[PDB]
PDB file of C-alpha atoms and ligand atoms in Angstrom:
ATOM      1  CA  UNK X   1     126.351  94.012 103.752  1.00 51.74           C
ATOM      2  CA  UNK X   2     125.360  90.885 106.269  1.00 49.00           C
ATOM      3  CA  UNK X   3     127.530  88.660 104.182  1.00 49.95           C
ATOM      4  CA  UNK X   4     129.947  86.593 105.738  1.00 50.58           C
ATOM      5  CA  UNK X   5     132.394  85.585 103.107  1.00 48.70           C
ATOM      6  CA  UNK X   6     133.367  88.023 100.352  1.00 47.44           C
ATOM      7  CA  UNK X   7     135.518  86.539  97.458  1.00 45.86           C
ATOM      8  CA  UNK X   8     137.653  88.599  95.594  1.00 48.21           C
ATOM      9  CA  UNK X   9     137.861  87.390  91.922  1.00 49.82           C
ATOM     10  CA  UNK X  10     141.174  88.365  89.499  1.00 47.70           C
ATOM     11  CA  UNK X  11     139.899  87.146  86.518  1.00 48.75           C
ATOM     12  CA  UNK X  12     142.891  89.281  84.418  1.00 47.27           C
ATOM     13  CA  UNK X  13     145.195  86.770  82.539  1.00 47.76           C
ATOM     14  CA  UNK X  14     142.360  84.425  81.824  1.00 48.58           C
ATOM     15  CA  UNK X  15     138.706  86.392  80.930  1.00 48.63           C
ATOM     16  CA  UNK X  16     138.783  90.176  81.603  1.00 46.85           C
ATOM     17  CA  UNK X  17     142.691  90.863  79.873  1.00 48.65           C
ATOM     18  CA  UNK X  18     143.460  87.791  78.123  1.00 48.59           C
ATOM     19  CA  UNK X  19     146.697  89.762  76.369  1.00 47.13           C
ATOM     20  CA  UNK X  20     148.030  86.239  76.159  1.00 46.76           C
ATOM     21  CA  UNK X  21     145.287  85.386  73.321  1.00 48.91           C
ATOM     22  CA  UNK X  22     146.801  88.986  71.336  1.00 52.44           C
ATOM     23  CA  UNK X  23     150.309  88.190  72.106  1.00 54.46           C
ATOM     24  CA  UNK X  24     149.879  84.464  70.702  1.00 54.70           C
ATOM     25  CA  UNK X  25     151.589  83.247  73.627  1.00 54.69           C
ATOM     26  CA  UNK X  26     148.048  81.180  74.741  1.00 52.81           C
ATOM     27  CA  UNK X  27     148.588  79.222  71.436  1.00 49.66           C
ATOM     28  CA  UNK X  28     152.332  78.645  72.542  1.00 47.91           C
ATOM     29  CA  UNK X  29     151.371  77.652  76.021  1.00 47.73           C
ATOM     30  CA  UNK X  30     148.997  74.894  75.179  1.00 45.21           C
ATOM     31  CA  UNK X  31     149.476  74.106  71.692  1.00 42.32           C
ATOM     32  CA  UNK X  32     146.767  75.982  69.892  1.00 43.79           C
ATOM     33  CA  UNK X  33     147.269  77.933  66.456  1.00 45.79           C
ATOM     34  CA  UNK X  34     148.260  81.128  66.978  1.00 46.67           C
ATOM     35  CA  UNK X  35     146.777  82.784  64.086  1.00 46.74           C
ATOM     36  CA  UNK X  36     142.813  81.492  65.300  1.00 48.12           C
ATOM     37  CA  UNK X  37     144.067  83.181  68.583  1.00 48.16           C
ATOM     38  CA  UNK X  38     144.540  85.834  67.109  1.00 50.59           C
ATOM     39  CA  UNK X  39     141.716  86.615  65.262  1.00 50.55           C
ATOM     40  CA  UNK X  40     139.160  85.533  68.042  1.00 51.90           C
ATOM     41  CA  UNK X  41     140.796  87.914  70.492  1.00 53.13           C
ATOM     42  CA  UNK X  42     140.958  90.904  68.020  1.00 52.23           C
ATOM     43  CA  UNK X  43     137.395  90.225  67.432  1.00 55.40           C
ATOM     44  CA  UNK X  44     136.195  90.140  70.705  1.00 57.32           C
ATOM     45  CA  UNK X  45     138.157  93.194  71.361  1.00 59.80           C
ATOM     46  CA  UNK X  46     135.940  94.638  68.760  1.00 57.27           C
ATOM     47  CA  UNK X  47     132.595  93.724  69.700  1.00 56.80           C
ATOM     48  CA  UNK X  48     133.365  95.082  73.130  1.00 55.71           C
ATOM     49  CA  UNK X  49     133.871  98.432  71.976  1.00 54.45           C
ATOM     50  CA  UNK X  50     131.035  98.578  69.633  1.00 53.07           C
ATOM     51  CA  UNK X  51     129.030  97.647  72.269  1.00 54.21           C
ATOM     52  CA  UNK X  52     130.459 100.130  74.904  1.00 55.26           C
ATOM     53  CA  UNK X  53     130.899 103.022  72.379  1.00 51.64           C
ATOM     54  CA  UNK X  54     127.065 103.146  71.874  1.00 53.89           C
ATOM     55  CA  UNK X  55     125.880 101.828  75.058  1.00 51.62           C
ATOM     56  CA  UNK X  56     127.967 102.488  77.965  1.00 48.81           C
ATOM     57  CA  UNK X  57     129.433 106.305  76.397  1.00 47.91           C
ATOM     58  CA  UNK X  58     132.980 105.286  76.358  1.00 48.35           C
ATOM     59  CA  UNK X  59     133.951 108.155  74.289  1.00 50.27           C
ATOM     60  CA  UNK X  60     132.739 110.136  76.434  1.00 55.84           C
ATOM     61  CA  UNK X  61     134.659 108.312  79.701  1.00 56.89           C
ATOM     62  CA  UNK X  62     137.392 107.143  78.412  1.00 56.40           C
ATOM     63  CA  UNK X  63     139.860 109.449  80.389  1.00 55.00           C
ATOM     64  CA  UNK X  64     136.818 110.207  83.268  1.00 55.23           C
ATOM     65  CA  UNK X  65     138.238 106.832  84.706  1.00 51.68           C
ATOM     66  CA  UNK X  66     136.263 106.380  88.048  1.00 50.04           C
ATOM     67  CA  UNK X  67     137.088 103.050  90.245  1.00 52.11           C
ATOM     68  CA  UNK X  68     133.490 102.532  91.363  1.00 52.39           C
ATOM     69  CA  UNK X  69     130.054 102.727  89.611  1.00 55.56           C
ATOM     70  CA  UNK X  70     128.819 104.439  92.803  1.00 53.41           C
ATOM     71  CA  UNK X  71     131.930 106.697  93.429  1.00 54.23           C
ATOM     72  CA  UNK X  72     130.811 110.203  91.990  1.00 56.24           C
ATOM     73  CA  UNK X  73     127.366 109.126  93.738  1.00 57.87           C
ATOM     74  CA  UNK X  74     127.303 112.472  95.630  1.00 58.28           C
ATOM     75  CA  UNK X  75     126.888 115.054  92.653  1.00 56.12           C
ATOM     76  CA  UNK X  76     123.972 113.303  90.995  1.00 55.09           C
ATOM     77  CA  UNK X  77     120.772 115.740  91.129  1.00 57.71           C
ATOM     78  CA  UNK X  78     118.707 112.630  90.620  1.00 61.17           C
ATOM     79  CA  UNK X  79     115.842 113.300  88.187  1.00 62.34           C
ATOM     80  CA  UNK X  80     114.070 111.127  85.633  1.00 59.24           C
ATOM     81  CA  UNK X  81     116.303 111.360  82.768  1.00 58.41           C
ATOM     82  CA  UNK X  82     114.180 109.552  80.393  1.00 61.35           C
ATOM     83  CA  UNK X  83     114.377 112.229  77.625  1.00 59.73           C
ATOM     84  CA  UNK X  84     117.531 113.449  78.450  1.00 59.41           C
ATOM     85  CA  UNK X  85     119.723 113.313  74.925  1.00 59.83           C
ATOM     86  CA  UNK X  86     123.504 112.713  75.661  1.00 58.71           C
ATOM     87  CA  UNK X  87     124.713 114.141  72.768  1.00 62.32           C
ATOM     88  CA  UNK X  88     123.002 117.117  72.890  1.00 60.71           C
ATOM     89  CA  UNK X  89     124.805 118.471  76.142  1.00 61.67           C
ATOM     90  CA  UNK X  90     127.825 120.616  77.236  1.00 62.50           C
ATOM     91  CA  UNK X  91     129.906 117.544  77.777  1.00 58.35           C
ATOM     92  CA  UNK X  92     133.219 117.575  75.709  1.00 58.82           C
ATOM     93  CA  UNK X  93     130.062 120.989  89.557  1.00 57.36           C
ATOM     94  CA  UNK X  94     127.813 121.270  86.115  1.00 57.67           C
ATOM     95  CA  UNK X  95     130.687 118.635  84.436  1.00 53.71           C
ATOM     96  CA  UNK X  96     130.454 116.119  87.477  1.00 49.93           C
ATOM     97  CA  UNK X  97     126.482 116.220  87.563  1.00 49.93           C
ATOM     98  CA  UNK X  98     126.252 115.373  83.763  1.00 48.56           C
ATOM     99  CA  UNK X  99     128.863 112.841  84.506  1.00 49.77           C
ATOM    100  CA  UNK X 100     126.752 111.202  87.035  1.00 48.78           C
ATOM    101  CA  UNK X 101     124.584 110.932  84.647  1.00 47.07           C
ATOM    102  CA  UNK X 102     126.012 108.819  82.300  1.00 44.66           C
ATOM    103  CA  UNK X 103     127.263 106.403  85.340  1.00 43.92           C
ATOM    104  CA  UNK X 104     123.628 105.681  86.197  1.00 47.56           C
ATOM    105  CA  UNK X 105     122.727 105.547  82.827  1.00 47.18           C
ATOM    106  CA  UNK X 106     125.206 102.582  82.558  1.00 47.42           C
ATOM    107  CA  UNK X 107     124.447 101.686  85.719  1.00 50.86           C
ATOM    108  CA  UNK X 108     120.620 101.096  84.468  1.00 50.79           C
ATOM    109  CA  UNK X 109     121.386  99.237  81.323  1.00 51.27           C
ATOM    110  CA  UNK X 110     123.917  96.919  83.243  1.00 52.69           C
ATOM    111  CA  UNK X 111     120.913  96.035  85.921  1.00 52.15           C
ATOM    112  CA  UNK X 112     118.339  95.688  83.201  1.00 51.87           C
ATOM    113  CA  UNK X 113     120.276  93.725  80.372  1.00 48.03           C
ATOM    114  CA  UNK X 114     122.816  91.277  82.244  1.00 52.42           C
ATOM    115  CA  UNK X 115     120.635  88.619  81.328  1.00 51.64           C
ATOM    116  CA  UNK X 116     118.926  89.930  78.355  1.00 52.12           C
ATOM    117  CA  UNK X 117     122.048  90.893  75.729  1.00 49.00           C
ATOM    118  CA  UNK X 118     119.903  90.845  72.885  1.00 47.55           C
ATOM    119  CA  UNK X 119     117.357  93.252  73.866  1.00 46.03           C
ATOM    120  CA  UNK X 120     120.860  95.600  74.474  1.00 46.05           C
ATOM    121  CA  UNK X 121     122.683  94.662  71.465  1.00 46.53           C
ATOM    122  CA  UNK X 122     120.283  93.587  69.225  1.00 47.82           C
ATOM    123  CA  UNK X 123     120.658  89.698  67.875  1.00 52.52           C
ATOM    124  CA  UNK X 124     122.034  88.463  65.603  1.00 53.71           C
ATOM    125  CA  UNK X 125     124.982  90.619  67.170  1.00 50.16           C
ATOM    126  CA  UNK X 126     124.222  88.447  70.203  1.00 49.85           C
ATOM    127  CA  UNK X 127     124.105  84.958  68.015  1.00 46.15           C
ATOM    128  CA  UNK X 128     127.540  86.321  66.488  1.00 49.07           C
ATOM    129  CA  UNK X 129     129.074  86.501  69.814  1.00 49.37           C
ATOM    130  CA  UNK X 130     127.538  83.274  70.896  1.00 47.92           C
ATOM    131  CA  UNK X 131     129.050  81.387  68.327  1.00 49.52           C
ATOM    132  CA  UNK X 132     132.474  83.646  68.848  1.00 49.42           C
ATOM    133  CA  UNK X 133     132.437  82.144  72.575  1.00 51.37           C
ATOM    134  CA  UNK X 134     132.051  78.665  71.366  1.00 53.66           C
ATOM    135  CA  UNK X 135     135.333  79.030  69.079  1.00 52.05           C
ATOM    136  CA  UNK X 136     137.579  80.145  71.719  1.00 51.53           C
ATOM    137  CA  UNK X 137     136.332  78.205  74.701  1.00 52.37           C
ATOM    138  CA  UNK X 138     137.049  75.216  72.234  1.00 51.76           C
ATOM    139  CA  UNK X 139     140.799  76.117  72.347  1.00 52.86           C
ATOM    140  CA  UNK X 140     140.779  77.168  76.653  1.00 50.36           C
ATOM    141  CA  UNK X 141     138.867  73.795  77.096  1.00 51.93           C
ATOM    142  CA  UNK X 142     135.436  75.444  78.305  1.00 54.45           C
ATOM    143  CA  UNK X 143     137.472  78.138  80.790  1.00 51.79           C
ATOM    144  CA  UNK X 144     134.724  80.724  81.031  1.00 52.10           C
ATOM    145  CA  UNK X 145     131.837  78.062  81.217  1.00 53.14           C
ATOM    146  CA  UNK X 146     133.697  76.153  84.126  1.00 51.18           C
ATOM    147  CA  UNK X 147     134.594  79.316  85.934  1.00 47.84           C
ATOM    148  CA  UNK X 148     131.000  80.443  85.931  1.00 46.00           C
ATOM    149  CA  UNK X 149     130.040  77.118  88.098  1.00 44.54           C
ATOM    150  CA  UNK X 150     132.140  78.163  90.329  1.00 46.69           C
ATOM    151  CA  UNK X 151     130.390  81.579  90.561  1.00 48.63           C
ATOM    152  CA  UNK X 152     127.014  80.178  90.766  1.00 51.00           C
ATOM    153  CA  UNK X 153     128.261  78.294  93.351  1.00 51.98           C
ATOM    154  CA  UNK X 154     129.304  81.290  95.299  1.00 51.52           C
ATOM    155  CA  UNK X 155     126.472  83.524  94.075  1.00 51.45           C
ATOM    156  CA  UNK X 156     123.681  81.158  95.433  1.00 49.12           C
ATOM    157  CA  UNK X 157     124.685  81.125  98.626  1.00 51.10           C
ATOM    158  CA  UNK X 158     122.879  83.810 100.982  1.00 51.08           C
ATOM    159  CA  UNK X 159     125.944  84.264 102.962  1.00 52.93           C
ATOM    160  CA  UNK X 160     128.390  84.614 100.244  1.00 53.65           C
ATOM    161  CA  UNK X 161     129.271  86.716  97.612  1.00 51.31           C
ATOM    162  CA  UNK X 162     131.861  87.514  95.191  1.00 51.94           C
ATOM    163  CA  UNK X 163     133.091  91.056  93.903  1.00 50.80           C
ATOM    164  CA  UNK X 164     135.778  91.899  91.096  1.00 48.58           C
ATOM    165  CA  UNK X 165     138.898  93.643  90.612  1.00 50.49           C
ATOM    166  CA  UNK X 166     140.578  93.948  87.666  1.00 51.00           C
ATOM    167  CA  UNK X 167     142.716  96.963  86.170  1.00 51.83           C
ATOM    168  CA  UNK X 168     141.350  97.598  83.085  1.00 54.20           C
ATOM    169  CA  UNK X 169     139.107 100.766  82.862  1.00 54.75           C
ATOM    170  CA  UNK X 170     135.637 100.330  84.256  1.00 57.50           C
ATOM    171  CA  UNK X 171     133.564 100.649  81.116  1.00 58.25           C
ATOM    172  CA  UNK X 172     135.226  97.951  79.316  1.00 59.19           C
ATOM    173  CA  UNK X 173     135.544  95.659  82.566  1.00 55.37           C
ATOM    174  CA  UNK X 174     131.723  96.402  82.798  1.00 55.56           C
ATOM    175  CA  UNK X 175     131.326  96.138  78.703  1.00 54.24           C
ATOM    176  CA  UNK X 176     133.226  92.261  78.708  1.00 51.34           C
ATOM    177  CA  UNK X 177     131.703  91.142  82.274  1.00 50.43           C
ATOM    178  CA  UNK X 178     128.065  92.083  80.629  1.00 50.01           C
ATOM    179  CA  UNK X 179     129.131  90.233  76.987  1.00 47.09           C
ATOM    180  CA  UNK X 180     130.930  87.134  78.321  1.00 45.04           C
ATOM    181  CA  UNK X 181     127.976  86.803  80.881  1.00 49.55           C
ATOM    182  CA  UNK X 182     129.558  87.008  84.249  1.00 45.84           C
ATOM    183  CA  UNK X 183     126.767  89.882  84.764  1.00 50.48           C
ATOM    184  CA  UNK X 184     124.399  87.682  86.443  1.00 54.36           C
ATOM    185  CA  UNK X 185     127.260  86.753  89.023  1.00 54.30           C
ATOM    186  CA  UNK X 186     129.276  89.848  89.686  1.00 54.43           C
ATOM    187  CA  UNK X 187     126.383  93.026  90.872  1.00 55.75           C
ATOM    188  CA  UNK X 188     127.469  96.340  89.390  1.00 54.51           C
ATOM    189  CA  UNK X 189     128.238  97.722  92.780  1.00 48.19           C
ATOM    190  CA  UNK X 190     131.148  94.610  93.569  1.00 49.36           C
ATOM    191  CA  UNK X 191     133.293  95.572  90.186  1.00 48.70           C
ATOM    192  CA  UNK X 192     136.432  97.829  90.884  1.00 47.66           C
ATOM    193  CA  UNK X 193     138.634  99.395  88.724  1.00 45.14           C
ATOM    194  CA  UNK X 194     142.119  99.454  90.107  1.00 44.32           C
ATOM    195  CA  UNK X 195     143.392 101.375  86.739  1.00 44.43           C
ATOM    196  CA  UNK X 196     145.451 104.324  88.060  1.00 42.57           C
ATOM    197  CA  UNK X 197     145.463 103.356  91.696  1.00 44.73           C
ATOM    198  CA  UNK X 198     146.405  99.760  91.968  1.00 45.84           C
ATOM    199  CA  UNK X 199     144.618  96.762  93.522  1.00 46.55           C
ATOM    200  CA  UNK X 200     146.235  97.712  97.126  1.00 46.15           C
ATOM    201  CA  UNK X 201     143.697 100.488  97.415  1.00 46.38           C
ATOM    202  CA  UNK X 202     141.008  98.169  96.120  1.00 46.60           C
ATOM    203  CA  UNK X 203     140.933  95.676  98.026  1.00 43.57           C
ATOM    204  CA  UNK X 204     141.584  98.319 101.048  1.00 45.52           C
ATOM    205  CA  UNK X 205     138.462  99.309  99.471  1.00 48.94           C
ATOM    206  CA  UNK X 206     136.287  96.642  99.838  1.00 48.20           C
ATOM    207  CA  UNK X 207     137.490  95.925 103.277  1.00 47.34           C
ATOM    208  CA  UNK X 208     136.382  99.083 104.820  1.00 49.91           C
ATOM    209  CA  UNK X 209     132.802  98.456 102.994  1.00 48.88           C
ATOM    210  CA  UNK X 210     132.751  94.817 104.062  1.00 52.09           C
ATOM    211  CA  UNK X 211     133.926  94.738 107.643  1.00 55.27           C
ATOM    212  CA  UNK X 212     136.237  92.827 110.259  1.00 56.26           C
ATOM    213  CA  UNK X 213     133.276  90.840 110.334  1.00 58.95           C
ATOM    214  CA  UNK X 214     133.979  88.922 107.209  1.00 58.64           C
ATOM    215  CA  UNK X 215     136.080  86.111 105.694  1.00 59.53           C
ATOM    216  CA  UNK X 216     138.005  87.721 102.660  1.00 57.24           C
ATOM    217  CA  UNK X 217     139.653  85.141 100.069  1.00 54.39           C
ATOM    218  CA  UNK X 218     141.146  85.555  96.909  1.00 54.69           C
ATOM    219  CA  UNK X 219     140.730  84.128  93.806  1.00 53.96           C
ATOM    220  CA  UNK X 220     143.103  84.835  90.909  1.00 49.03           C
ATOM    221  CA  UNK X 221     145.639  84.190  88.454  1.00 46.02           C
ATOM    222  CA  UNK X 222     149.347  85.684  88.858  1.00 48.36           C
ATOM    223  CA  UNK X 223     151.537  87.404  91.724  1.00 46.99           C
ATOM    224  CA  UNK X 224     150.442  91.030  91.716  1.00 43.08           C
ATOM    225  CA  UNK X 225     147.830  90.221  94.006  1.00 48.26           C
ATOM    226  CA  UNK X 226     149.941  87.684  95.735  1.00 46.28           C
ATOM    227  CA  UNK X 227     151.474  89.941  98.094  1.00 43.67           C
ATOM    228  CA  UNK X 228     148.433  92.431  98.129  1.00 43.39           C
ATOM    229  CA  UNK X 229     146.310  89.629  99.571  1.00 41.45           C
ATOM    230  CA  UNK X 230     148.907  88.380 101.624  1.00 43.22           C
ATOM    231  CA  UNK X 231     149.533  91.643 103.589  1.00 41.60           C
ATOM    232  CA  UNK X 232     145.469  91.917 104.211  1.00 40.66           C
ATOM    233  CA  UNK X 233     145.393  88.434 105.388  1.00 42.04           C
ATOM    234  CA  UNK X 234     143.815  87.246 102.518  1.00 40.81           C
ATOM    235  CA  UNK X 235     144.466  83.727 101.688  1.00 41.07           C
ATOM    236  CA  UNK X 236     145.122  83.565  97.908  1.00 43.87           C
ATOM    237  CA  UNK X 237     143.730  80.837  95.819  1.00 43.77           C
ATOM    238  CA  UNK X 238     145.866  80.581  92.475  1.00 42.38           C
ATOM    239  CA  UNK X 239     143.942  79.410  89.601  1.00 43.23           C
ATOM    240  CA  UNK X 240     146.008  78.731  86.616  1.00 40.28           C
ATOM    241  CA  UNK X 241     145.291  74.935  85.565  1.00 42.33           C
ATOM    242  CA  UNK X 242     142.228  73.571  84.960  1.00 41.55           C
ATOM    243  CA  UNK X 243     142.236  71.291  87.755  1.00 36.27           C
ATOM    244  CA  UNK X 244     142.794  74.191  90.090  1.00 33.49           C
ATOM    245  CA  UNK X 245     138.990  75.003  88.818  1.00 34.21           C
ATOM    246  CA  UNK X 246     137.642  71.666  89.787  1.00 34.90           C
ATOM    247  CA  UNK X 247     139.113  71.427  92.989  1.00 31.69           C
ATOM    248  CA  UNK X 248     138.056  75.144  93.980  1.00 31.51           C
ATOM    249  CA  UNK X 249     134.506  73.645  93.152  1.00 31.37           C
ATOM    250  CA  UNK X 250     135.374  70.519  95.132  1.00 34.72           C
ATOM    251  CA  UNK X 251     136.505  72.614  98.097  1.00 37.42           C
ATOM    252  CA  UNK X 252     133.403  74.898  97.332  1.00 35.76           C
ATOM    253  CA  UNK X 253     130.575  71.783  97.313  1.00 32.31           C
ATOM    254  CA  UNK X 254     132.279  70.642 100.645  1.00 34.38           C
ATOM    255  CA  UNK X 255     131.549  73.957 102.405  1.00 37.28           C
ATOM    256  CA  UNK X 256     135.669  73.993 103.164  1.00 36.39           C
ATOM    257  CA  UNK X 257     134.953  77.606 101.894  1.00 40.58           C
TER     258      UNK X 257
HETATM  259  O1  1SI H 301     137.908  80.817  77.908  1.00 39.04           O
HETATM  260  C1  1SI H 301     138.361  81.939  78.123  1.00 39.04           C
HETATM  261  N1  1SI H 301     139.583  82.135  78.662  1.00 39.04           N
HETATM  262  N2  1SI H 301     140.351  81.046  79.041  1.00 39.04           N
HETATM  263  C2  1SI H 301     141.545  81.325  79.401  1.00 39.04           C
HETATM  264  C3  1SI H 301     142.454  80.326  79.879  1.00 39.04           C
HETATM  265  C4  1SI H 301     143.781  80.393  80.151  1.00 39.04           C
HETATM  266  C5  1SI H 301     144.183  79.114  80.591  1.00 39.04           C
HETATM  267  C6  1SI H 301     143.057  78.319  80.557  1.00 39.04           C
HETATM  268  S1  1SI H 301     142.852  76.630  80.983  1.00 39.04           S
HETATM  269  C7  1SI H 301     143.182  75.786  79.466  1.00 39.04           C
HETATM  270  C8  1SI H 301     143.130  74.400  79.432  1.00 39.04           C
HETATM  271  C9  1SI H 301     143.387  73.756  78.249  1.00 39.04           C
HETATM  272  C10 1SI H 301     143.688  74.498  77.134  1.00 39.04           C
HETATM  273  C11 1SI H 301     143.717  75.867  77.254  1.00 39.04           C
HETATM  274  N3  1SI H 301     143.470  76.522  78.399  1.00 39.04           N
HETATM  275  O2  1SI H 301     141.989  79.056  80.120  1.00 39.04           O
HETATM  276  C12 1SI H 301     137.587  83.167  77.779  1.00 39.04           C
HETATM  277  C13 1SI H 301     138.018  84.416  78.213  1.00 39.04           C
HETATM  278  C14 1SI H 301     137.295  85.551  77.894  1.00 39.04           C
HETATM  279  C15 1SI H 301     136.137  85.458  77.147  1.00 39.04           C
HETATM  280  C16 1SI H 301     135.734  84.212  76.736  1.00 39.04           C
HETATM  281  F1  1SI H 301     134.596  84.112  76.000  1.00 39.04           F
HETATM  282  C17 1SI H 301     136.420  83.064  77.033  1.00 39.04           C
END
């Protein structure tokens, strides 16, 4: 694209895997209770799935793990598919064009319900999640809502953008980022699924697509990505406090990025 920065967001640890909420250790870390932990994370696990499992066919691509939305883009006999019943098909070069399908089926649904949730999953299984956000952002102190400012931020600006790369598997990266609402702020095309390959070859990836033109910087949580932005001259912006949040925003509302 003509965008001049790109930021590169590694929201595992904090939003997309948040094993420390499972594990109990979040509750350990900053003096929660671990059993309310618990039980938000395992329930948020589950209205994920129920939402991906008859939305997003994750049954049907669990193991067909693709890294981009657009990646088997080249088999797709595109036709208006309107009628065309999923579970009436010889899915268990014909395989990869009925799996194209199902990509810009998700595809389609992503674009048309990242802000509209409750026309997807229909309320109250929206007003149940709402009120499942509220009672875990009240033990991470607001996490996800102050993140998202700093993704508007980024997102309004004409020359900027910001793209994901996490390692789960793309339909439930796509299932939580449409849920927890970051779908207005991360377009379908700028999530990658580093699963089997690593995020080396994704963020080689997004360079190539990008340019030498560009300002790449990194946003995320951990040392995996420490090294993998430092060897592509990607200046890494750690983001494990709270204040780290406020002054990214600070930096951010100063144009210093
Ligand atoms: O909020 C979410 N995560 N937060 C994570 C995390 C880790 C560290 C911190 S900072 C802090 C400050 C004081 C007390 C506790 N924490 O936040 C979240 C994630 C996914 C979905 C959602 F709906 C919400």
């Amino acid at each position: 694209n003509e965008i001049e920065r790109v930021f590169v967001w590694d929201l595992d640890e904090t939003i997309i895997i948040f094993h420390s909420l499972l594990t109990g250790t979040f509750a350990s870390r900053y003096g929660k209770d671990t059993t309310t932990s618990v039980r938000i994370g395992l329930m948020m696990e589950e209205m994920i799935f129920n939402l991906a499992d008859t939305h997003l066919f994750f049954n049907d691509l669990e193991d067909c793990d693709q890294i981009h939305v657009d990646d088997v883009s080249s088999d797709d006999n595109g036709q208006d598919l309107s009628t065309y019943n999923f579970s009436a098909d010889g899915f268990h070069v014909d395989w990869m064009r009925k799996l194209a399908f199902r990509y810009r089926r998700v595809k389609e649904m992503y674009n048309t319900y990242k802000n509209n949730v409750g026309g997807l999953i229909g309320t109250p299984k929206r007003e149940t999640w709402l009120q499942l956000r509220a009672e875990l952002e009240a033990l991470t102190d607001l996490w996800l809502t102050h993140s998202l400012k700093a993704l508007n931020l980024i997102n309004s600006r004409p020359n900027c953008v910001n793209v994901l790369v996490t390692t789960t598997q793309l339909i439930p990266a796509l299932a939580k980022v449409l849920l927890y609402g970051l779908g207005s702020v991360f377009p379908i095309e700028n999530i990658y699924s580093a699963t089997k390959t690593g995020k080396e070859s994704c963020f080689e990836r997004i360079m190539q697509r990008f340019g030498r033109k560009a300002v790449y910087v990194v946003i995320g949580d951990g040392v995996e990505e420490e090294q993998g932005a430092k060897k592509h001259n990607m200046p890494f912006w750690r983001i494990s406090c709270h204040a780290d949040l406020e002054a990214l925003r600070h930096a951010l509302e100063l144009e210093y990025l």
